[PDB]
Each structure stands twice: as structure tokens, then as C-alpha cells.
Scaffold this active site. Structure first.
Site, PDB file in Angstrom:
ATOM      1  N   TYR A   1      16.272  18.723  94.639  1.00 23.00           N
ATOM      2  CA  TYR A   1      16.862  20.390  94.246  1.00 23.00           C
ATOM      3  C   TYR A   1      15.975  20.689  92.923  1.00 23.00           C
ATOM      4  CZ  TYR A   1      18.764  24.984  94.451  1.00 23.00           C
ATOM      5  OH  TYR A   1      18.942  26.690  93.600  1.00 23.00           O
TER       6      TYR A   1
ATOM      7  N   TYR B   1      25.103  24.669  90.396  1.00 17.28           N
ATOM      8  CA  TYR B   1      24.970  23.151  90.817  1.00 17.28           C
ATOM      9  C   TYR B   1      25.889  21.664  89.933  1.00 17.28           C
ATOM     10  CZ  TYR B   1      22.315  20.251  93.780  1.00 17.28           C
ATOM     11  OH  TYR B   1      21.089  19.542  94.148  1.00 17.28           O
TER      12      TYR B   1
END
Ligand SMILES: NC(=O)c1ccc[n+]([C@@H]2O[C@H](COP(=O)([O-])OP(=O)(O)OC[C@H]3O[C@@H](n4cnc5c(N)ncnc54)[C@H](O)[C@@H]3O)[C@@H](O)[C@H]2O)c1
Ligand SMILES: NC(=O)c1ccc[n+]([C@@H]2O[C@H](COP(=O)([O-])OP(=O)(O)OC[C@H]3O[C@@H](n4cnc5c(N)ncnc54)[C@H](O)[C@@H]3O)[C@@H](O)[C@H]2O)c1
Ligand SMILES: O=c1oc2cc(O)ccc2cc1Oc1ccc(Cl)cc1O
Ligand SMILES: O=c1oc2cc(O)ccc2cc1Oc1ccc(Cl)cc1O
Lengths: 277, 287
Positions: A170, A180
């Protein structure tokens, strides 16, 4: 004929499932590795038909699942399991370490030729990086990054040459995604760098390819990413797990024999943007 | 059923032919756009069966070619063609070879197409290092090797369906230093890679069309031979020695990646530079 082991699936809502669906179009036989604590639930749902619609490929065929095995990315070999072996959600299962699974598959079906790493785990994902503990950080790297290396180390012995491996990553590894947290960004950065190093070693030693797919969000925060992606990506279609699936299928085939060590973006082009308008 | 225009074929030795060959395998109809300096030579060779072995796909399949058209990416429209060129010995007998005219012609003959390949480059001064490249030579390289992609897009998006797909080819000298890659080719490829992103934004949002570029490893094509003052033999030997995958890189290796990008199997990939080079780009220190 071709066999793919997919490590890291818990439901039909993620990347692993969509990768399995698309490979099935090419008549690849699929083996799923499922995280032990959700293994029985998964088998239950499976046996109760819950996944039946999701298994339909086209007018003619369903997904050919060759097997489903308990698989734990935390444990390299039987010698690495600590009480744990006799924990509630572990003690009715056996042979679920990375080496045990490789031995089992090989014992039952011989050599395989496709490998998918599709697992990510960070206990402190909700904490930002600066407030992540050492334990949380290292747990994330262990489960999400080292597990790729270990997978490769134990499965090469049971793969055919010209075999192919992919993982999922990602864009938070390369650019800042607030939210994140927990070292997941760090884990992805290590995963992408290791893909290159592994590519060198596997390439020269075994003629085996390895690449990684940097996917856009799929709800398998994620609501924001999906909203922001759909509003600002160059392509305004909905990103589907099967969009990742078909790319995986291509990378896992001889069609891509000259591609290795790459991070391939499958994200409707969102990664190319700087300034949202 | 799919139609692809491939701009930049001169023979069977380049990436354009390998892309054609792999697209044929998927029953895509292919139209060749051929630079006028080499057009007659190519057709004659083709008509005399010289390319017959080369069109052999497998034990039961041969390439099928819908059309072959004279094409020069220097020229956007007929009004751009200078008199000297228009009357030149190799151009004077040819017509509808500008970017706009060839788009119109293809549309008129075949309707809308769904795949576009830019597989060309040129630089008058490739043999000079960048520092010693003239303004005119630098701009020649950019015009022919980079702007041509932009203009190809502007004119073709009107003859393409939604969900269509465009690819070009680039080389890693845009990103890392390859000293012998002169005359502003490195510059041209850097621009082309950046423009691929900017174009992906515009085409994606307004047309649902994708664009990507393939960064290929070395291949002994006619144009790669042009480079030496040899450059491509060094490149190839080095790649075969130091790449993660130590096998000969074939034009069809690029060709099957092009085919993937041009197909709907890659519908969520756009704006990207995809390396098809046996992994060589990932290396820092050659062991
Ligand atoms: N979903 C997204 O928006 C997103 C975006 C980009 C990349 N990715 C990557 O995609 C991959 C798959 O994620 P997903 O969204 O499909 O979730 P998923 O549920 O489909 O698959 C990830 C699986 O990893 C499993 N897992 C966790 N710890 C494990 C362990 N130690 N051993 C074995 N399995 C374990 C979980 O059960 C989970 O099912 C992950 O690597 C993730 O980082 C996800
Ligand atoms: N061969 C390599 O090692 C290498 C490496 C990376 C990328 N590439 C790229 O691949 C593409 C094709 O190159 P190749 O190596 O196959 O060489 P090539 O000789 O096959 O292709 C160049 C072709 O483009 C045509 N052309 C040149 N100028 C033109 C113009 N003004 N209008 C129309 N056609 C024109 C030429 O006639 C020639 O056929 C190029 O973009 C090149 O930069 C090549
Ligand atoms: O499967 C996952 O499992 C996880 C498990 C965790 O404990 C923490 C994060 C993840 C992330 C996971 O996937 C992601 C989901 C969404 C995005 Cl945008 C990126 C991802 O990597
Ligand atoms: O197509 C080309 O067309 C040309 C036209 C010129 O006038 C000079 C060089 C080229 C190079 C060309 O292709 C290349 C060949 C080899 C490598 Cl490694 C990279 C390339 O870009």
C-alpha cells in the site's frame, strides 16, 4: 497443471478472494491458508454455503478450491510455537506453521508454481507511528513483512522453476497516510524493499519471479480512503478485488516472465496525483 | 472485436513487431503506422514474403495484419508538412500520413478502435552527450519522441471507445544515468514518463481512457544500432550478466506485457511506468 497457494484469507471480501476468483478463470487450482483463529469459522461458513455465490466464476464454472489449511504467518517452524499450541483456538489444529504448511501441501499435491502473500497485521494500527510501542511495531514487521521472506524460504523447495510469487502492499510506504498507523507503513516499506532483494536472490538462484501489488482501498479511515479515491483517482470506476485479481493473475503467469522485483500500482491511478482539485 | 494501431514499425526486429505478434495471438486486429522513409522497403519485403517466418506465432498460428499505413509523427496535420518534405523522393507519392489524417483514415476505413501503441523515437544527435547537444537537436528529440505521444492522443481519443487503452515505450536512462544515451533521448524519455501521468489524469477523467508506458530492457533493433558512434551490445551483455533473470530479453516479452496493459485485464492501472527488463532496474551494485 497449475497450483497457487494463497496465504492470508479470512472471508470473501478481501484481495485474496478476488485473486482466487481471477486465477480460477485460468483453471488454476487454489489452496487457501487461513489464520488459525478464524479457520473453523471459515470452514463453517464454507460448509454452510455462505460463499457459494462468491465462488461462481462464469456461466460454466465455480472456483476450484483444491484445499483449505490453517496457516499462521507468525511461526516459521514447529519449534517456534510457545501455551499457544494449547490455546483455545489453536489446540484442535495442527501443522499450521509456515514450514509445516509447505511440507503438507508438497506431501499431498507435489510441487506448486504460484504463491500469494496477502496478509497484514498490526496490533497498534490505530495508534500513530510516533505512539507505537516496540512490541507493536515489531509484531507488525514480523507478521506483515518477515512472513514474506519466510514464505519464500520454505516454499521455494516445493515450487517449479519459472514459478512466480506476489504480495500486496500500500502507498503509505512511500507517501504519508495519516491513519495507517502501528508500523503498517513501515511494514509496507520493508515489504517493497524486500521484494527487490528477494527478486535478485530468487531470480539468480531459482529462476523464480517476485513482485508486489500496491492496491487501492477496498473495504474488506477506509471509508475516507475509498471516498477520496473515488472522487480524485484518474479513473472514476469502483475498484474491485477482481481488478487486483486479474493483475495478480497476469503477474503470476508466463505472460510477465520479464517482470520481477516491481511494485505495480493497481489503484485507478490515484498514486500519480499530487494536488487534488 | 479489438483493433490496435501500432505507430513505429520499420521491420521485424523491434518492439513494435513483438507487440503486434503478441496482440495477434489474442485475435486483436493490428494496423501498422510506418515511417515514410522506410515504408516502400517494408511493403516490398512484406509482399515478397520476407516476413513470413517472422509472422509465425506457433505451430498453427500466423500474424494477421489488417492494414499498413504510411505515418510520420513529426506532423500533426497536413498544414504542418513543410514543402521540402512534401516533395521529397520518399514522401511525394504518399498521402494521409500526418497524425490527424491517419486518425481520420483509420476511422473512415474501420470505425473506432480501442488500442493505441506509440513505439517510436528519434534524435538527430543521439551520438552526442547531452552537454554537447544543440538546441535544435534536443528539441528534435523531444518533438519526435515525446510530443508525438501527446498529439497521437489528442487526435486518436476521438476515434477511440471508452475503456480503450494507450501505451508507449521508454527506457530507464530517464531516471538513471546511461552515458551513451545522448542527444536528449534521456530528456525525451523523462518527459514522456511525466506526460504519461499528466495524460492519464486528463484521459481518465474525460474519456475513461487509460495510458501507461513500458520501460523496456535492451533489444538489438535497427534503431538501437543507430546509437553507437557498440552501445546496444554492451547494454545487452550487461543485462544478460547482471539482471535478476538471466535470459535473453525478447521483443515478445515486452509484447505480452503490452497486450496485458492494452486489455481490460489491467483496467485499474493507469499513469504508470512498468519495467519489463528482467529486473535490471532494481540493481545498484553489479556483483
Ligand atoms: N484492503 C485494502 O484497502 C488494502 C490496500 C492496499 C493493500 N492491502 C493489502 O492487502 C492484503 C490483504 O488484505 P485484505 O484487505 O484482503 O484483508 P483480508 O481479510 O482479505 O486478508 C488479510 C488476511 O490476513 C490474515 N492474517 C492476519 N494475521 C495472520 C497471520 N499471522 N497468519 C495468517 N494470516 C493472517 C487475516 O485473517 C486476513 O484475512 C494485505 O496485505 C493488505 O496490506 C489492503
Ligand atoms: N531497443 C531498445 O533497447 C529500447 C529500449 C527501451 C525502449 N525502447 C523504445 O522502444 C520503441 C521502439 O524502438 P525499437 O528499439 O523497437 O526501434 P525500432 O527501429 O524498431 O523503432 C523505431 C521505429 O520508429 C519509426 N519512426 C522513427 N521516427 C518516426 C517518426 N518520425 N514517425 C513515424 N515513425 C517513426 C522508425 O521507422 C522505426 O521503425 C522506442 O520508443 C524506443 O525508445 C527501445
Ligand atoms: O488486511 C489488512 O489487515 C490489517 C490488520 C490490522 O490489524 C491492521 C491493518 C490491516 C490492514 C489490512 O489491509 C489494509 C486495509 C486498508 C488499507 Cl487502505 C490498507 C491495508 O493494508
Ligand atoms: O527507437 C529508437 O529510435 C532512435 C532513433 C534515433 O535517431 C536515435 C536513437 C534511437 C533509439 C531508439 O530506441 C532505443 C534503442 C535502444 C535503447 Cl537501450 C533505448 C532506446 O530508446
Amino acid at each position: 497443471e497449475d497450483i497457487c497457494f494463497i496465504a492470508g484469507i479470512g472471508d470473501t471480501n478481501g484481495y485474496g478472494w478476488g485473486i482466487a476468483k481471477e486465477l480460477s478463470k485460468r483453471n488454476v487450482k487454489i489452496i487457501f491458508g487461513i489464520w488459525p483463529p478464524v479457520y473453523n469459522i471459515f470452514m463453517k461458513n464454507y460448509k454452510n454455503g455462505k460463499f457459494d455465490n462468491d465462488m461462481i466464476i462464469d456461466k460454466d464454472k465455480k472456483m476450484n478450491i483444491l484445499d483449505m489449511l490453517p496457516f499462521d504467518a507468525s511461526f516459521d517452524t514447529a519449534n517456534d510455537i510457545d501455551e499457544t499450541k494449547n490455546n483455545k483456538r489453536y489446540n484442535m489444529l495442527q501443522n499450521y506453521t509456515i514450514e509445516d504448511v509447505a511440507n503438507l501441501i508438497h506431501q499431498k499435491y507435489g510441487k506448486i508454481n504460484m504463491l500469494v502473500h496477502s496478509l497484514a497485521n498490526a496490533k497498534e494500527v490505530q495508534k500513530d507511528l510516533l505512539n507505537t510501542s516496540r512490541k507493536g511495531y515489531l509484531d507488525a514487521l514480523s507478521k506483515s513483512s518477515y512472513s514474506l521472506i519466510s514464505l519464500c524460504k520454505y516454499f521455494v523447495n516445493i515450487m517449479k522453476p519459472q514459478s512466480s510469487i506476489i504480495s500486496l502492499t500500500y502507498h503509505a510506504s512511500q507517501k504519508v497516510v495519516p491513519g495507517y498507523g502501528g508500523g503498517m507503513s513501515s511494514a509496507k516499506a520493508a515489504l517493497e524493499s524486500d521484494t527487490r532483494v528477494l527478486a535478485y536472490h530468487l531470480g539468480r538462484n531459482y529462476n523464480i519471479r517476485i513482485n508486489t501489488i500496491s492496491a487501492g482501498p477496498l473495504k474488506s479511515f477506509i471509508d475516507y480512503a475509498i471516498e477520496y479515491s473515488e472522487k480524485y483517482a484518474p479513473l472514476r470506476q469502483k475498484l474491485l478485488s477482481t481488478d487486483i485479481g486479474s493483475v495478480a493473475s497476469f503477474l503470476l503467469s508466463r505472460e510477465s516472465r520479464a517482470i520481477t522485483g516491481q511494485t505495480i500500482y493497481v489503484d485507478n491511478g490515484l498514486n500519480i496525483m499530487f494536488l487534488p482539485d
